[PDB]
Design a protein around this ligand. Structure first.
Ligand SMILES: CO[C@@H]1O[C@H](C(=O)O)[C@@H](O[C@@H]2O[C@H](CO)[C@H](O)[C@H](O)[C@H]2O)[C@H](O)[C@H]1NC(C)=O
Ligand SMILES: CO[C@@H]1O[C@H](C(=O)O)[C@@H](O[C@@H]2O[C@H](CO)[C@H](O)[C@H](O)[C@H]2O)[C@H](O)[C@H]1NC(C)=O
Lengths: 133, 132
């Protein structure tokens, strides 16, 4: 397991910037956001080739230790052996993951927490920089 | 304040922390090590705290026990402004680079093969954390 950050006081509107390195042999990587490891309002999992998925982003929530229903997208703006930057924010309705080029993924806010307190990276993704602004 | 785990910061690698020092700051803390009980560096600039003023306080914590405290004479921090600190370590010392060109060494007393844990506290709002 990779970088774990807690006591982030990320309130609605505030923006979490993460820059990291995608491994050359990347099958998938994971960015987890929420209250703690059992309460995730966003499980952001780009799968190059993993768990039956190829070049597909799988988003989900985890509520009280229980996974929710997976949501899949068409576009896949990630490539192995490269640098990936995401800007993440949320409001009462959705979590939004923005990519520099203009890509924008919305995931429904299923947990409705006051803040994002927890971030964890996993899989083939080496976090290089985290910024709160 | 912010807590980071599984940093896996190896010797020679550099940890960059940028933050916002409160206008009425009394003190803030950067803790580095294995966990809250095992700190190879307790970095504690004191503006107006524990009877001290404009003093950089450093110490270690080994198995819950504070080590022998040390202090630097300079103080390149100024409340109500942005401050950046860069930390690295070898087997002998931790090297802390301060904003205004200043740099000092704190003896490596914990014999860890990596820094895996960081905790911020006090009047210091972290804005950026970088690893390389
Ligand atoms: C059988 O379908 C597959 O089920 C697995 C599973 O372990 O249940 C799914 O993989 C997990 O997905 C969650 C998020 O929902 C998380 O990413 C875990 O790390 C995965 O192990 C998988 O999505 C699913 N595959 C399909 C239906 O394509
Ligand atoms: C006179 O000794 C003083 O003891 C206090 C104490 O509470 O034990 C010291 O304050 C602590 O310092 C450690 C690091 O050394 C850490 O910062 C704690 O948060 C503080 O409570 C104080 O530094 C010390 N004064 C001296 C030795 O000048």
């Amino acid at each position: 397991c990779g970088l774990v950050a807690s006591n982030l006081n990320l309130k609605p509107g505030e923006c979490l910037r993460v820059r990291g390195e995608v491994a050359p042999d990347a099958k998938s990587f994971v960015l987890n956001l929420g209250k703690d490891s059992n309460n995730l309002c966003l499980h952001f999992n780009p799968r190059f080739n993993a768990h039956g998925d190829a070049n597909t982003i799988v988003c989900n929530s985890k509520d009280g230790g229980a996974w929710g229903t997976e949501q899949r997208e068409a576009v896949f703006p990630f490539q192995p052996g490269s640098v990936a930057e995401v800007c993440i924010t949320f409001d009462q309705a959705n979590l939004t993951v923005k990519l520099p080029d203009g890509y924008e993924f919305k995931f429904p806010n299923r947990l409705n927490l006051e803040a994002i307190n927890y971030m964890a990276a996993d899989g083939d993704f080496k976090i290089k920089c985290v910024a709160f602004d």
